Design an enzyme around this catalytic site. Structure first.
Site, PDB file in Angstrom:
ATOM      1  N   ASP A 156       0.784  -1.170   0.018  1.00 52.00           N
ATOM      2  CA  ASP A 156      -0.144  -0.130  -0.065  1.00 52.00           C
ATOM      3  C   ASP A 156       0.850   1.263   0.013  1.00 52.00           C
ATOM      4  O   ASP A 156       1.875   1.161  -0.853  1.00 52.00           O
ATOM      5  CB  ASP A 156      -0.853   0.037   1.043  1.00 52.00           C
ATOM      6  N   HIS A 170      -3.596   6.021   4.265  1.00 48.45           N
ATOM      7  CA  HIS A 170      -4.157   4.891   3.706  1.00 48.45           C
ATOM      8  C   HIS A 170      -3.730   3.422   3.943  1.00 48.45           C
ATOM      9  O   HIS A 170      -4.575   2.613   4.627  1.00 48.45           O
ATOM     10  CB  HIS A 170      -4.513   4.876   2.294  1.00 48.45           C
ATOM     11  N   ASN A 178     -14.352  -0.258  -5.913  1.00 47.54           N
ATOM     12  CA  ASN A 178     -15.419   1.081  -5.451  1.00 47.54           C
ATOM     13  C   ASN A 178     -16.226   1.462  -6.424  1.00 47.54           C
ATOM     14  O   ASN A 178     -16.593   2.629  -6.231  1.00 47.54           O
ATOM     15  CB  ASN A 178     -14.866   1.924  -4.406  1.00 47.54           C
ATOM     16  N   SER A 236     -11.297  -1.371   0.268  1.00 51.74           N
ATOM     17  CA  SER A 236      -9.842  -1.337   0.964  1.00 51.74           C
ATOM     18  C   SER A 236      -9.892  -1.441   2.358  1.00 51.74           C
ATOM     19  O   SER A 236      -9.109  -1.890   2.779  1.00 51.74           O
ATOM     20  CB  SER A 236      -9.452  -0.145   0.555  1.00 51.74           C
TER      21      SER A 236
END
Length: 279
Positions: A39, A69, A161, A224
């Site tokens: 990530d 994130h 998403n 996520s």
């Protein structure tokens, strides 16, 4: 073990029903397993990680999480308050810049890094990888995730998403990995969640409370956010000896809460991750 006043998602993964707020789990808690978080990085010094997180690779000028994130996903995998697997080891691989974006070739290199790097780590109970990332369809991105799985790592990826069929996104559409959609606290499909025959499981994804950079916390939403719940659950189940890396995704779906979510399109599985822990 019982954690009172837990985030709703942790309570849900150890419940047959929605609406409770205590997380129940075996005290082994993933000890002796390892989870790679691929990530934006991980703020390893966050007190919530208790020394169990470290950065092992970056492709940028710093290995630090300047976005938040990657720190938030790693907190859902394994932080003391917000994590599924509270004793697992966390390894960060920064393939995304501090804006949350990264080239596919850098992402492919990070996946190949993990498949070799796990031979440099002590993980007697097994290895997991959590990829909360994705983009448009790519056969080379799918084949990278397929190789990482084949090497002996349970790979969990976000469905995406886009409120669309995940067949058009990568690595979501690789069939050999665990593709994860998102649900909310009322057992509804998250409004942003992708769906389709390629999905394998759902996890909690709307309004998820976890660690943030600067030693803070916050609540965000996304597939996520559901991915690290499943990643952490697989590390938990591998430590208990219930399953292996090659077969955890199948095991998780076999043992999931079935038919509990609403607004699941025809042809998509109706399966919510569940640890089956009996206190």
């Amino acid at each position: 073990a019982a954690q009172t006043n837990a985030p709703w998602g942790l309570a849900r993964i150890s419940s047959t029903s929605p609406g409770t707020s205590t997380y129940y789990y075996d005290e082994s808690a993933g000890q002796g397993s390892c989870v790679y978080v691929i990530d934006t990085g991980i703020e390893a010094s966050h007190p919530e990680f208790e020394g169990r997180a470290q950065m092992v690779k970056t492709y940028y000028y710093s290995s630090r999480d300047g976005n938040g994130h990657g720190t938030h996903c790693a907190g859902t995998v394994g932080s003391r308050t917000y994590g599924v697997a509270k004793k697992t080891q966390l390894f960060g691989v920064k393939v995304l810049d501090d804006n949350g974006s990264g080239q596919y070739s850098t992402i492919i290199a990070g996946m190949d890094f993990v498949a070799s790097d796990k031979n440099n780590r002590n993980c007697p109970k097994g290895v997991v990888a959590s990829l909360s990332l994705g983009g448009g369809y790519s056969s080379s991105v799918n084949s990278a995730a397929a190789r990482l799985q084949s090497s002996g790592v349970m790979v969990a990826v976000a469905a995406g998403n886009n409120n669309a069929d995940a067949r058009n996104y990568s690595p979501a559409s690789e069939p050999s990995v665990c593709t994860v959609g998102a649900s909310d606290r009322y057992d509804r499909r998250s409004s942003f969640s992708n769906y389709g025959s390629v999905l394998d499981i759902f996890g909690p994804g709307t309004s998820i409370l976890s660690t943030w950079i600067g030693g803070s916390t916050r609540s965000i939403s996304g597939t996520s956010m559901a991915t690290p719940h499943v990643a952490g659950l697989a590390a938990y189940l591998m430590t208990l000896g219930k399953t292996t890396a090659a077969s955890a995704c199948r095991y998780i779906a076999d043992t999931a809460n079935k038919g509990d979510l609403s607004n699941i399109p025809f042809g998509t599985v109706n399966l919510l991750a569940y640890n089956n822990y009996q206190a």
